[PDB]
Design a protein around this motif. Sequence first.
Motif, PDB file in Angstrom:
ATOM      1  N   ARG A  16       0.851  -1.224   0.000  1.00 34.39           N
ATOM      2  CA  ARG A  16       0.000   0.000   0.000  1.00 34.39           C
ATOM      3  C   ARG A  16       0.879   1.263   0.000  1.00 34.39           C
ATOM      4  O   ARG A  16       0.300   2.368   0.059  1.00 34.39           O
ATOM      5  N   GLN A  17       2.210   1.115  -0.071  1.00 34.79           N
ATOM      6  CA  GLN A  17       3.199   2.227  -0.020  1.00 34.79           C
ATOM      7  C   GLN A  17       3.512   2.693  -1.447  1.00 34.79           C
ATOM      8  O   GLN A  17       3.279   3.882  -1.744  1.00 34.79           O
ATOM      9  N   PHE A  18       4.013   1.777  -2.285  1.00 35.82           N
ATOM     10  CA  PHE A  18       4.563   2.044  -3.641  1.00 35.82           C
ATOM     11  C   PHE A  18       3.849   1.166  -4.676  1.00 35.82           C
ATOM     12  O   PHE A  18       3.028   0.309  -4.286  1.00 35.82           O
ATOM     13  N   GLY A  19       4.158   1.385  -5.959  1.00 33.98           N
ATOM     14  CA  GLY A  19       3.503   0.731  -7.108  1.00 33.98           C
ATOM     15  C   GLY A  19       2.255   1.484  -7.535  1.00 33.98           C
ATOM     16  O   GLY A  19       1.604   2.092  -6.659  1.00 33.98           O
ATOM     17  N   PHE A  20       1.927   1.440  -8.830  1.00 35.16           N
ATOM     18  CA  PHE A  20       0.814   2.205  -9.453  1.00 35.16           C
ATOM     19  C   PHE A  20       0.054   1.335 -10.459  1.00 35.16           C
ATOM     20  O   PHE A  20       0.699   0.565 -11.196  1.00 35.16           O
ATOM     21  N   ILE A  21      -1.278   1.453 -10.459  1.00 38.36           N
ATOM     22  CA  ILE A  21      -2.197   0.993 -11.544  1.00 38.36           C
ATOM     23  C   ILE A  21      -2.557   2.217 -12.392  1.00 38.36           C
ATOM     24  O   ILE A  21      -3.257   3.104 -11.868  1.00 38.36           O
ATOM     25  N   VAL A  22      -2.097   2.250 -13.647  1.00 32.19           N
ATOM     26  CA  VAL A  22      -2.426   3.312 -14.647  1.00 32.19           C
ATOM     27  C   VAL A  22      -3.645   2.831 -15.442  1.00 32.19           C
ATOM     28  O   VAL A  22      -3.593   1.705 -15.975  1.00 32.19           O
ATOM     29  N   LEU A  23      -4.702   3.648 -15.486  1.00 35.83           N
ATOM     30  CA  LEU A  23      -6.004   3.322 -16.130  1.00 35.83           C
ATOM     31  C   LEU A  23      -6.500   4.533 -16.930  1.00 35.83           C
ATOM     32  O   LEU A  23      -6.336   5.673 -16.455  1.00 35.83           O
ATOM     33  N   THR A  24      -7.054   4.277 -18.119  1.00 32.81           N
ATOM     34  CA  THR A  24      -7.525   5.306 -19.088  1.00 32.81           C
ATOM     35  C   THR A  24      -8.966   5.684 -18.717  1.00 32.81           C
ATOM     36  O   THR A  24      -9.846   4.803 -18.776  1.00 32.81           O
ATOM     37  N   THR A  25      -9.171   6.943 -18.316  1.00 33.19           N
ATOM     38  CA  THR A  25     -10.450   7.500 -17.797  1.00 33.19           C
ATOM     39  C   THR A  25     -10.967   8.578 -18.753  1.00 33.19           C
ATOM     40  O   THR A  25     -10.285   8.854 -19.752  1.00 33.19           O
ATOM     41  N   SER A  26     -12.117   9.174 -18.427  1.00 33.07           N
ATOM     42  CA  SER A  26     -12.738  10.317 -19.147  1.00 33.07           C
ATOM     43  C   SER A  26     -11.713  11.437 -19.361  1.00 33.07           C
ATOM     44  O   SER A  26     -11.552  11.872 -20.516  1.00 33.07           O
ATOM     45  N   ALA A  27     -11.056  11.872 -18.280  1.00 36.53           N
ATOM     46  CA  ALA A  27     -10.088  12.996 -18.245  1.00 36.53           C
ATOM     47  C   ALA A  27      -8.894  12.689 -19.159  1.00 36.53           C
ATOM     48  O   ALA A  27      -8.648  13.473 -20.099  1.00 36.53           O
ATOM     49  N   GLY A  28      -8.193  11.585 -18.885  1.00 32.65           N
ATOM     50  CA  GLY A  28      -7.014  11.125 -19.646  1.00 32.65           C
ATOM     51  C   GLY A  28      -6.373   9.906 -19.004  1.00 32.65           C
ATOM     52  O   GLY A  28      -6.963   9.368 -18.044  1.00 32.65           O
ATOM     53  N   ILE A  29      -5.209   9.485 -19.508  1.00 32.65           N
ATOM     54  CA  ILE A  29      -4.432   8.328 -18.969  1.00 32.65           C
ATOM     55  C   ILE A  29      -3.688   8.809 -17.717  1.00 32.65           C
ATOM     56  O   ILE A  29      -2.868   9.740 -17.840  1.00 32.65           O
ATOM     57  N   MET A  30      -3.978   8.195 -16.565  1.00 34.47           N
ATOM     58  CA  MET A  30      -3.434   8.589 -15.236  1.00 34.47           C
ATOM     59  C   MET A  30      -3.500   7.403 -14.267  1.00 34.47           C
ATOM     60  O   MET A  30      -4.289   6.471 -14.517  1.00 34.47           O
ATOM     61  N   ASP A  31      -2.702   7.457 -13.197  1.00 37.64           N
ATOM     62  CA  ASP A  31      -2.560   6.373 -12.185  1.00 37.64           C
ATOM     63  C   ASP A  31      -3.757   6.389 -11.224  1.00 37.64           C
ATOM     64  O   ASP A  31      -4.478   7.407 -11.182  1.00 37.64           O
ATOM     65  N   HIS A  32      -3.946   5.282 -10.496  1.00 35.35           N
ATOM     66  CA  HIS A  32      -5.076   5.008  -9.563  1.00 35.35           C
ATOM     67  C   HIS A  32      -5.211   6.109  -8.500  1.00 35.35           C
ATOM     68  O   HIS A  32      -6.363   6.475  -8.194  1.00 35.35           O
TER      69      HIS A  32
END
Lengths: 83, 149, 185, 83, 129
Positions: E96-112
């Motif tokens: 729960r400290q480090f690492g990222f899920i990047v997901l494509t949303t309405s706004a743009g491509i960005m991390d969780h």
Amino acid sequence: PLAKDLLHPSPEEEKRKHKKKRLVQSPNSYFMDVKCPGCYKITTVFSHAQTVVLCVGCSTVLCQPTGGKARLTEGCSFRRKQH
Amino acid sequence: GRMHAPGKGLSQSALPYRRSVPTWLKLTSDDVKEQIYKLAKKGLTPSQIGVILRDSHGVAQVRFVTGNKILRILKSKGLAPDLPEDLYHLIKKAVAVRKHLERNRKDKDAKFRLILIESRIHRLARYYKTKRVLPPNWKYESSTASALV
Amino acid sequence: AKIVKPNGEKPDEFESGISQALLELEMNSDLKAQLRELNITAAKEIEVGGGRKAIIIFVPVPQLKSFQKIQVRLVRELEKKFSGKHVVFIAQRRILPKPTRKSKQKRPRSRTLTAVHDAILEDLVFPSEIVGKRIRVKLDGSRLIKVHLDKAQQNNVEHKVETFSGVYKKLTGKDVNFEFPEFQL
Amino acid sequence: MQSDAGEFVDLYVPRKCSASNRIIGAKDHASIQMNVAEVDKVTGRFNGQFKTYAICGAIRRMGESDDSILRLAKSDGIVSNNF
Amino acid sequence: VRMNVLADALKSINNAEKRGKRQVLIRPCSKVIVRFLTVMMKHGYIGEFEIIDDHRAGKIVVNLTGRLNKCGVISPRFDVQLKDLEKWQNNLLPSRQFGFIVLTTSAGIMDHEEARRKHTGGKILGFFF
RNA sequence: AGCGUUUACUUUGAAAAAAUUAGAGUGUUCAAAGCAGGCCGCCUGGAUACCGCAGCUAGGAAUAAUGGAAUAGGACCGCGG
């Protein structure tokens, strides 16, 4: 080796590599001004012709098509041209 | 790799980066179009026209010298063939194989290669039907395939 | 004058001065045979990096190739007239907005931002055609378009690189650096 | 490596390989700590200061210890840039 | 055939990072790959990269820093609602400290963490830790 | 008041039986429960959340489909009808 500049490769590496696998692909072929000794005129011939290019009004055969590059006739000055 | 073979050939044309026309070339857009017309009139397909041009005259692409592609030029002036020149060659090939197979009935290999060619005809024919360069009636059937040149 | 401004408005004293200079150049010099039906769309003047200035001219896209034919022969006596400045012709491309969900035919792909900006850069460096592009994405997030120019016209246009960088930063808003490679031609 | 307050909590901090940028494990026995001597410019004699490098076990048995030491030294300006 | 282009690009980076290579040439460049790599750079897992224009699909040369354990893709692009982003980031990421899920949303491509803050769910692209 | 290539996606809102589960209050003597109670006539309570899918509603426009001029029955602009 870990450290190799894939952005700035020296041109012997790119001339070695397959034409499609260079950093930006480019043709191995070229155009050359070939003239027979008799006539005054220079006609553009492609390196890998694949047709029998004739000097105007069927004077004589100029190049013979082969597997790869075309055999130019014996006694013909060719100057490959650049752009 | 190849559609109907186990081969993985990497051997095609590699256009240069520069879409520009070379300095030495004195032929203009309309001069090339005039010769494209004459070659096609003599009785010649867009593949052969492009070959004859860049072997003899020095025209890397018609698309870079002119604005348009060879078939696009031909079918504007109205010299273009009715069915495309790749589906033509596949059908003519299927006719030549099937005629050879008529006499040589013990040729099981010729039988198998006819199935691959006619499968490839069916496959390409329906692409053209969706794009609407064939009437949706269009049906390749071997009996009335020899009459299509 | 010879300036046909698109909107039925006033070619201002600055743009007029160049349109009159082109009428005078025509009437005096040999290449008046060409300058019969060639026209200007507009002509701004930017301040390029250093203490230098670059007068910029706009052209109807149809007659661009007609300008291109005599572009280098013409720009010489424009720079000899307007002494301590650089001049370069650019075609005025129309640029249509990306059709959103909210709201007339299919937008042609020459009337789009990426194609127009590619065509702007093509015309900036007229005598020296482009042979390479590398878009360095820097660590802050910003880009840097690195153009490789044909090694013929190097000596002729190597002194105009900062003019081109400044003009493109103005017209588009994108940072560009023009390099000359040694390894192809 | 510190808690909410700001107290450095882990009982030691391991070294990182200069070539690969992996952390050198507590028992990576094929990891080296090599001091290349620093030389006075005018005399060409040893000062009493050194330019130290660490390398991981995997890099050495890969056979990239040679080129990596070389490139680190050539970056520092110990080896001439010309080379 | 080449169905997924981002899948090829992230496997290429992952293989090069394990082998200890200092830069890698990922071929079929696309808006989705570049926008993925910008996010990956902004947190500081990769270095500066340079995208190479031939008049086709471009190429990318990514300068690699040895601080990338894994960069993977999720196919198919599952439709992650906002509340379910917990159970996704629970079973994909190391801690729960480090690492990222990047997901494509309405706004743009960005991390969780950004998508959680902006109050947007979207389609999952991949993860990097 | 009327408008605006379509859909999938995501966010908000509307409408969604109670009991059950999660859950706020409350010394049933504790607890399981219960919906009561508390203060020397009066003061409180009987909340809130969840209820996939489909339908409805209003924002977003990345990603994924689909469409628009190519024998021009093209858009716009005005006259002739």
